[PDB]
Design a protein around this ligand. Structure first.
Ligand SMILES: NC(=O)c1ccc[n+]([C@@H]2O[C@H](COP(=O)([O-])OP(=O)(O)OC[C@H]3O[C@@H](n4cnc5c(N)ncnc54)[C@H](O)[C@@H]3O)[C@@H](O)[C@H]2O)c1
Ligand SMILES: NC(=O)c1ccc[n+]([C@@H]2O[C@H](COP(=O)([O-])OP(=O)(O)OC[C@H]3O[C@@H](n4cnc5c(N)ncnc54)[C@H](O)[C@@H]3O)[C@@H](O)[C@H]2O)c1
Ligand SMILES: NC(=O)c1ccc[n+]([C@@H]2O[C@H](COP(=O)([O-])OP(=O)(O)OC[C@H]3O[C@@H](n4cnc5c(N)ncnc54)[C@H](O)[C@@H]3O)[C@@H](O)[C@H]2O)c1
Ligand SMILES: NC(=O)c1ccc[n+]([C@@H]2O[C@H](COP(=O)([O-])OP(=O)(O)OC[C@H]3O[C@@H](n4cnc5c(N)ncnc54)[C@H](O)[C@@H]3O)[C@@H](O)[C@H]2O)c1
Ligand SMILES: Oc1cc(Cc2ccccn2)ccc1Oc1ccc(Cl)cc1Cl
Ligand SMILES: Oc1cc(Cc2ccccn2)ccc1Oc1ccc(Cl)cc1Cl
Ligand SMILES: Oc1cc(Cc2ccccn2)ccc1Oc1ccc(Cl)cc1Cl
Ligand SMILES: Oc1cc(Cc2ccccn2)ccc1Oc1ccc(Cl)cc1Cl
Lengths: 277, 277, 280, 280
């Protein structure tokens, strides 16, 4: 009985979903953490059967639960009155990082797989030089610190030899004009933090953590990235969300017990190239 | 007539000073940017001649000016009332990043060298896993975004083929337990941002930017780092603030016109080692 | 699913651990064995020495294999006539490719699990040209050539792995003879190969940077491995003992279709030691 | 201040640009010249061809030098008797070391500015063992051996540099013959050497990863350099044209005492091209 919490899904079109699908093959029970502002929409679509085709594995994806989850709030203490008043949030509760860990632990006990699959930058459209302090720190808060806080709070509800992964992108290491707003900065911090966290979690809890540097998925510039990737990557096949999924599944399993602190590239090998051929 | 603004000095015991000294050999005019809370102390010591020995180059260090400078505020607009009221700040003015660029430009015209030499993390003593969101973002704000904002505002007051450097540390790339509070995260972001900035500044202004990854200088754990470095680094000599200074001088000169976006290690080669010998 | 494992000489190394793990997924294993140790390995197999170690493997075949030789024409007269090669046939790279293809058809998995350097005991500065080139020939070029001849007997979408060590990237004094150089070249060649193999053949290639394991080869170095192992178990983020099957299950994953979007990569399987700068 | 420059054959490469820049700081330059091009280089010197290019250099000496040979005993009979070596003496590595020491005493600067690969035109997968080993011997081992023999005729706190190319780290199709492999090994060897040289000799060693320059060697590759240059001038963060003196002033800095705390490093002098992932 393995249970994985996936923080950061909004539809079946991203990595979170591809990871849920592949894990389901291993009979892993899935819990979704969903950004409150799209939680109700997601529940509706799910109810209206919009995801039924997406859920087929002759095996059904076993979704144990779907919970509102906001990566920018650590505890009930951090909720500002403007979101308290806020339309969407008003009718939802217990969606802070610590609140969700308590809920899950209470309802289902300890888990052993954790997926951080979320990024947000309010100024992702502006290049770095034109990003505001507010926009930059928002990017870091939502995309980088959220990983640390996730680990801080979920470690108490995880079994020993548990495993954790996040998703990153090569803009951290090499220049991708157009990946702005401090998203590149956020990814660089996330990959560094993955190492620092791997040391602490490894020594203190025997828990592993790694990150997957993924190629482009259509989930503007994304159309460029995907086209360029499919033209110039070593491997011609289309990169599927389940290509990341099967890698994630392996990193979350005990088959990878000796791998931690790593950035693992799942991008058809595009990262290895220097000049177009 | 070359002029360099050095943001982030508080005494003659750090890299900023070593960089000022070496630049002075090249007859570069120096302007110091000093954290307001220690500005007056610094001025006093300077007046009381405490730095006279430190200033000798048979050449005097030519300090063109010394200005209060706070890396956490971008413009006059960002000054919160608590600092406005604040003792130290109350008797100082025009210390925001944009304010200082305007002052310098007004008093002295355009400059062609910029040094970012500052780091601060309010929770540097806590390890990453135990760092608060507030502490983490403060680290990023002061140590990383400050570089971007410095470039944003000083580029308008710099000549073409100007040059910029900052200071970083290898904890960004490899684990150094004890370098906490998100300082490691901040350095990783700074090294990544150095590349992104190098592209923008290079293409749009023909300005270069690089960062120096420095070994330990006594400016607790620092005593460990220095001892370990002196035991295990390829080069036995003591690492001097002027070892960083002479490298900085070269990176800021036109002798390095074809180098940009780089992290340059000035650490007696310690970075190259895996296991102690 | 058939895998050729090039470079196994006993049950104490990574090759055996890889064999073991691939067997679990019902992969057919073919051993390529260096002729100097070929006979003794055979003898121990039939005399059931490895029986405790195979806990049961599916060993399709065991062939003489020397990665120094690309084709039969490359075998020098002395080696040809040597006591231990006497006496043996079809052990070059081209020859084992052909032989394997005749017996079994096309395969889909390849493991390069070998390395050799005559002067490993010398530090780099003191290595001769001859010793250095030997290291690169046996440890690095052998991979390139293995690929060249096996790509024709491999299907799409097959997978190739090799084994490397972090001394290529960071200084490990005592890892001498140009072995550091050979691992650096091999990690670079893995990228270049991943490009050509991916484009032209839809074949994948990656390399595993393993942590210390007390193997035959590891002892060839003048207690270095004992210190290595002991240091890793003390300072690695993960303090479990590193097993050859830890690498093996990672090898199995890389060779399987589950890793179809990974290529050209150096993957560290070393309890995380590589991420550390300063000892604790 | 005396610098030996190993690997100059005309005024169109990095060696010349390095010579030029070192002259500016009043450094005494000794050229080591490959015997195949030794005579013509001499002839052009006295016939004032390079006069426009030396705008005045301080050329202390010009010696025959072949980095394929470690000692006189390494010279094969054919080479020994060849039309172009006929006729020449003391051109091995040990021999030039000794010769330079006798004429001038100890030096404090060394530049490895050479590379060679018989099969550069072939892609890696199609390179023979012989071609690959040639690339590593001439381009990589030559540095190690240069160090071995020159450390005895160098003072503390002397400095050594070599030249490399980013194809070691990222795939550049067309950079064949094992040249990519040779650059990867050389960048690794630079670290290992920096350790031994720093500890035992207080001598520094670094390598410069240069951008494209239309040199003799660069054209040996089957328009590749023209595309390289054109691509760099279009996509590099800095759009100025990359000059051999751009590398030269960086070489001068690395060789001088101003860089006393830098060692084991790969320093990119390439208008920043290396930092880019996606074309504009
Ligand atoms: N798609 C790509 O080409 C690509 C490439 C590399 C990395 N990634 C990474 O993959 C991860 C998943 O993104 P994706 O591409 O699958 O798109 P996605 O929309 O499937 O995933 C991002 C999800 O994060 C959620 N989210 C946003 N703000 C949040 C908050 N404050 N709290 C909680 N959740 C929030 C959103 O609902 C969104 O669904 C991201 O971390 C992204 O950086 C994506
Ligand atoms: N000393 C080392 O061992 C070492 C190693 C690697 C990198 N570095 C880097 O070198 C740089 C200089 O630090 P140092 O070691 O010379 O110590 P330092 O005290 O000389 O430099 C840091 C200075 O930044 C100033 N500062 C702090 N908060 C500020 C703010 N909000 N606005 C403006 N200025 C502020 C302080 O007055 C302080 O003097 C830092 O960026 C540090 O990260 C130091
Ligand atoms: N043991 C470690 O700590 C360690 C760490 C990192 C990487 N590696 C790598 O793992 C691989 C396997 O080494 P190991 O540690 O398992 O030792 P091992 O002795 O078990 O494996 C090496 C095998 O290669 C064979 N071999 C040597 N030269 C050959 C040739 N010319 N032709 C064919 N076969 C030849 C030998 O017979 C030997 O059995 C090597 O590439 C090694 O560099 C080992
Ligand atoms: N040109 C470029 O675009 C470029 C880019 C990056 C790195 N580099 C490197 O710079 C260095 C110099 O190359 P270059 O581009 O200036 O070409 P070049 O032809 O000017 O320099 C190479 C020189 O090395 C000499 N040489 C070759 N084999 C030799 C041997 N066995 N003994 C002694 N001398 C020998 C040749 O006579 C030749 O003059 C090389 O290491 C090269 O890899 C060049
Ligand atoms: O983080 C992401 C990275 C890439 C890679 C990419 C896509 C297109 C062009 C260049 N790079 C694509 C999508 C990504 O998703 C996001 C982007 C911005 C934000 Cl604010 C949030 C997400 Cl989830
Ligand atoms: O940023 C710094 C890095 C090192 C390197 C080091 C020193 C000691 C032990 C380990 N690493 C030493 C001092 C540093 O200065 C700072 C550290 C924390 C802060 Cl909050 C600010 C500064 Cl300027
Ligand atoms: O690549 C290898 C790495 C280690 C780990 C190690 C060895 C020595 C010191 C520290 N760690 C052990 C053996 C390795 O492979 C070899 C190296 C040289 C030779 Cl000659 C043979 C082999 Cl199989
Ligand atoms: O290391 C080198 C790099 C470049 C730049 C380049 C060459 C080809 C394609 C793209 N860029 C040109 C020449 C280089 O050196 C050599 C490579 C092979 C040989 Cl045989 C000789 C030399 Cl000097």
């Amino acid at each position: 009985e393995d249970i994985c919490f996936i923080a950061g899904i909004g539809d079946t079109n991203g990595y979170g979903w591809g990871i849920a699908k592949e894990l389901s093959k291993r009979n892993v029970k899935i819990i979704f953490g969903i950004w409150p502002p799209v939680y109700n929409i997601f529940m509706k679509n799910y109810k209206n059967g919009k995801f039924d085709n997406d859920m087929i594995i002759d095996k059904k994806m076993n979704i144990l639960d779907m919970l509102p989850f906001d990566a920018s709030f650590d505890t009930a203490n951090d909720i500002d009155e403007e979101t308290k008043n806020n339309k969407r949030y008003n009718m939802l509760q217990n969606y802070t990082i610590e609140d969700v860990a308590n809920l899950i632990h209470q309802k289902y006990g300890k888990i052993n797989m954790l997926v951080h699959s979320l990024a947000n930058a309010k100024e992702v459209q502006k290049d770095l030089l034109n990003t505001s302090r507010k926009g930059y720190l928002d990017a870091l808060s939502k995309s980088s610190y959220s990983l640390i806080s996730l680990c801080k709070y979920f470690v108490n509800i995880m079994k020993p030899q548990s495993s954790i992964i996040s998703l990153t992108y090569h803009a951290s290491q090499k220049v991708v004009p157009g990946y702005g707003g401090g998203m590149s900065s956020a990814k660089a911090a996330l990959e560094s933090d993955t190492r620092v966290l791997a040391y602490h979690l490894g020594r203190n809890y025997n828990i592993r953590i790694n990150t997957i540097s993924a190629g482009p998925l259509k989930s503007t510039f994304i159309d460029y990235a995907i086209e360029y990737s499919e033209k110039y990557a070593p491997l011609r096949q289309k990169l599927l969300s389940t290509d990341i999924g099967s890698v994630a599944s392996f990193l979350l399993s005990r088959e990878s017990r000796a791998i931690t602190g790593q950035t693992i590239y799942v991008d058809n090998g595009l990262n290895i190239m220097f000049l177009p051929d």
